[PDB]
């Protein structure tokens, strides 16, 4: 979803350098049917780019995309919980991840309670918890 | 129809946001709304207006070509919601 | 049976949270129907007892001689059983347009599996969206009828019957 | 039932003109084994005919047949309700018929209530109501 | 289990001795709690590494569990 934008970014860059120039922007804007001011295009490049050299990488776009996310509050809170529970950032919550956030958060449970939460949250039987299994417990 | 009755309607769609004008009730920036407009009209611009980012006047060429693709699709609206040899036997006998 | 119903299980979001034991105990219950074109599955008034997944083909849904829903590949019809726990009549004919491949499951085996796999059944309820309820009769009017009503401008005792309408008010 | 009489009316007329003469009446009365007075036959023709020309059509008989109906009160009331609900007179009550008599009688219901009465009264699933489905609701 | 329960309901005096004598080599119901040695190797690695209120109440719900 987040990475699925950049194919149209392949339609953005005409040179093929990973750096959107002003001439490619003017070409696609004239292809859009509009005749914009190139000074305003330089303004849009300087506001969009973090490199500030007349061209921007897609990581420089990623902050503007995260600003343009503007999703729901509940999914953002649960995504924050999923990001702080997955310390590996692999989209999966290990039992060691649950034990380490039990120690770091303060709520200390026994190891059987860790495996109990793992076995109760998991449905498909993989020893780890996905985001849908996460919101299954975030619902109640 | 086969009975020539007007039984169904077909409404085909595309995204003409970048082609006409960007207008937002609210947005983060002009580039952000412009980026959302380009990401929305992806299959319009991408797999139809292929060589059109090199050329100018896309409203005169590529948007007209997408409308003509819709015109050829209306030419292909002919299925009309309906169901769509003894010489070989005698030939094999002889 | 799991390989036979891969055409459901790899496609639907209702099944990708299931345990593999639940996958096998479901796949052992899935019949497979090869619908000929023009042949109808649920006639209007027949018992809906088996939600169907459409893995191939095209279907029409006829309520009062009118196409109400066209069902394509990956659509689910029938009736939600586990919420209702009630047998209903088919309010619509369901006919096939092409050579259709369906993977059906009757409500009894479905309820057996869902009673056994309790943690799965909630995610199943949350994820399975019926493409067409065959219980819920949909209210609509035809354009010939409002053409007749527009014609009725040219046209422009009840007490034993309107009390019956008041009985309709009591209804 | 009402139209099923006229085959014997085919036995009534001997000429075959759709007009019962006095000579055919005298012939069938002598065939009945009785020797009636032809003046009384002219009296019966003048009392029976609405044309008043010594001969009567079957529509002139239809008023005497409706007078000679003398059916039950309940079936006559329900037949009156069926005749005033079928404005088309086709033996069937459309949903537009129910809506128009809801507007004309005064009892205004929503369109879903019209289709609810249609779906509840109908059994065989035709979108319209027959006389047996009519008396199914006229009973309760 | 159905035919077993039929027989054990019929042979009542046998079923007690059956319960006393039959020792299951493995209960397939009772999930056994254990940890892997890769997991405690990861925990020994976690010495290098060394908001909760909406979730820890859920853990308190685990206390309620």
């Amino acid at each position: 979803q987040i990475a699925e934008f950049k194919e149209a970014f392949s339609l953005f860059d005409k040179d093929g350098d990973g750096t959107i120039t002003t001439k490619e922007l003017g070409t696609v804007m004239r292809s859009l049917g509009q005749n914009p001011t190139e000074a305003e295009l330089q303004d849009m490049i300087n506001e969009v780019d973090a490199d500030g050299n007349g061209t921007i990488d897609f990581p420089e776009f990623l902050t503007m995309m995260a600003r343009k996310m503007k999703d729901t509050d509940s999914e953002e809170e649960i995504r924050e919980a999923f990001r702080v529970f997955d310390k590996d950032g692999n989209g999966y919550i290990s039992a060691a991840e649950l034990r380490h956030v039990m120690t770091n958060l303060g709520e200390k449970l026994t190891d059987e309670e860790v495996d109990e939460m793992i076995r109760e949250a998991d449905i498909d039987g993989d020893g780890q918890v996905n985001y849908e299994e996460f919101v299954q417990m975030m619902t109640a | 129809n086969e009975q020539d009755k007007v039984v169904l309607f077909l409404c085909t769609f595309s995204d003409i946001t970048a082609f006409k004008q960007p207008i937002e009730d609210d947005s983060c920036k002009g580039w952000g709304k412009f980026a959302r407009l380009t990401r929305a009209l992806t299959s319009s611009r991408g797999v139809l207006q292929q060589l059109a980012p090199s050329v100018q006047k896309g409203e005169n060429v590529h948007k007209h070509s997408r409308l003509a693709e819709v015109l050829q699709l209306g030419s292909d609206i002919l299925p009309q919601y309906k169901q769509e040899c003894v010489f070989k036997t005698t030939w094999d006998w002889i | 049976c799991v390989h036979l119903n891969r055409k459901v299980f790899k496609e639907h979001p209702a099944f990708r949270l299931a345990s593999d034991g639940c996958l096998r105990a479901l796949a052992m219950e899935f019949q497979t129907v090869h619908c000929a074109p023009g042949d109808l599955i649920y006639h209007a008034g027949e018992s809906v007892d088996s939600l169907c997944f459409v893995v191939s083909g095209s279907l029409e849904v006829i309520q009062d001689d009118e196409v109400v829903a066209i069902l394509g590949k990956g659509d689910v019809f029938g009736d939600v059983f586990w919420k209702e726990a009630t047998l209903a009549q088919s309010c619509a004919n369901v006919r096939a347009l092409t050579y259709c491949d369906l993977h059906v499951i009757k409500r009894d085996a479905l309820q057996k599996v869902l009673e056994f796999y309790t943690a799965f059944s909630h995610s199943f309820s949350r994820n399975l969206i019926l493409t067409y309820n065959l219980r819920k009769r949909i209210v609509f009017r035809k354009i010939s009828d409002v053409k007749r009503e527009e014609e009725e401008r040219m046209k422009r005792p009840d007490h034993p019957v309107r009390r019956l309408f008041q009985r309709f008010r009591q209804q």
Side-chain angles (χ1 to χ4, degrees), chain A residues 25-26 28-29 31 33-34 36 39 41 43 45 50 52 54 58-59 61:
Chain A
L25 187 51
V28 303
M29 273 300 303
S31 290
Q34 306 165 19
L41 267 64
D43 292 1
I45 288 159
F58 175 70
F61 174 74

Side-chain angles (χ1 to χ4, degrees), chain C residues 57-83 85-146 148-149 151-152:
Chain C
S58 316
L59 286 93
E60 65 164 325
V61 175
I62 297 180
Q63 193 172 82
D64 312 286
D65 285 333
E66 283 307 310
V67 175
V68 181
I70 292 300
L71 309 181
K73 182 169 170 292
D75 310 343
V76 191
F77 66 99
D79 190 18
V80 172
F81 310 113
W82 59 95
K83 288 180 165 298
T86 309
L87 213 57
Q89 297 214 10
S90 48
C91 49
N93 299 309
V94 176
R95 211 163 62 161
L97 313 158
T98 42
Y99 290 102
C100 278
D101 262 9
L102 308 181
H103 286 238
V104 310
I105 170 169
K106 319 291 180 184
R107 66 164 289 174
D108 49 3
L110 181 72
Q111 274 179 310
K112 281 181 188 173
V113 170
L114 288 183
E115 276 170 358
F116 194 50
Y117 298 92
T118 46
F120 164 68
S121 62
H122 297 296
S123 47
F124 187 67
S125 202
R126 293 196 308 255
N127 290 350
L128 184 61
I129 300 173
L130 265 190
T131 311
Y132 197 79
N133 255 273
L134 278 180
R135 163 187 308 195
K136 196 212 296 180
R137 162 91 166 88
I138 303 179
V139 56
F140 62 98
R141 208 187 269 181
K142 303 156 55 56
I143 295 174
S144 157
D145 205 73
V146 296
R148 281 188 158 192
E149 204 278 328
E151 182 265 332
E152 279 312 299

